[PDB]
Amino acid sequence: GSHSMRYFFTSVSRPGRGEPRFIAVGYVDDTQFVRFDSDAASQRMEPRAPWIEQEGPEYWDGETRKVKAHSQTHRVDLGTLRGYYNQSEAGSHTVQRMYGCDVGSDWRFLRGYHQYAYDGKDYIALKEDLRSWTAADMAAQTTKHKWEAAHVAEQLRAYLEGTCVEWLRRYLENGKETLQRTDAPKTHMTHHAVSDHEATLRCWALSFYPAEITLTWQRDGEDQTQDTELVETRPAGDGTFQKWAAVVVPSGQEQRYTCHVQHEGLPKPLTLRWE
């Protein structure tokens, strides 16, 4: 499989209610391993996965150092964008940043990213070539110049192509039991009569990891993408994910519908049918 390490940062200003809020979370694939919350008591990077709890005091020390470094950078960022967009100082604004790296099945660098948004819209982002920026508006363009002169892409390239993949790998081995485990989907189907001439057919895909999955309904082998309810893949809170696909079916016709399940955990895609 392909693996990823990602950092999610969220900064939200609170006009007259104190310092801006700063939340940071960090994931390895579909597992969250650490967090930082500007309102938490500790004021340090906390572990959110059992396999990072093993890290020594220096790691926590250094990640807590970096994490509030980021935090400060985001407390200043709220103010610059405000000036850039000529915004009142009365209203709350949101900044969002995301960076990380992807590795292939060989555990080798595949792609590196660094994205930034202001009030839910793309602000500035690092291209796949790690040498050029996508500025959205002129304000983003002033940021682009500034990051060009400070040679930030070069610095970020070394990070995503190196220390990122390097520590991703370490995490992978360190948490081998739950990071390198691929749980196939526990699948099952339900039949609910809606009226005397119709009935709901529900395909279930429970306790799987990773999150990726293809839950499809087909009638007479042809896909029913237009008339199927499909819920977004949701967390079960036990490290696994759940999902379902539902199709309303004319009673006496359950047998021509077939649910299809595609997941890394299965050697072969499942085809279930009501019967």
């Binding site: 970096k66 994490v67 950078t73 960022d77 610059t80 850039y84 602000y123």
Partner: peptide
């Protein structure tokens, strides 16, 4: 493992 340093906008 977080990245350092981080430049503002």
């Amino acid at each position: 493992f977080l990245k350092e340093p981080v430049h503002g906008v």
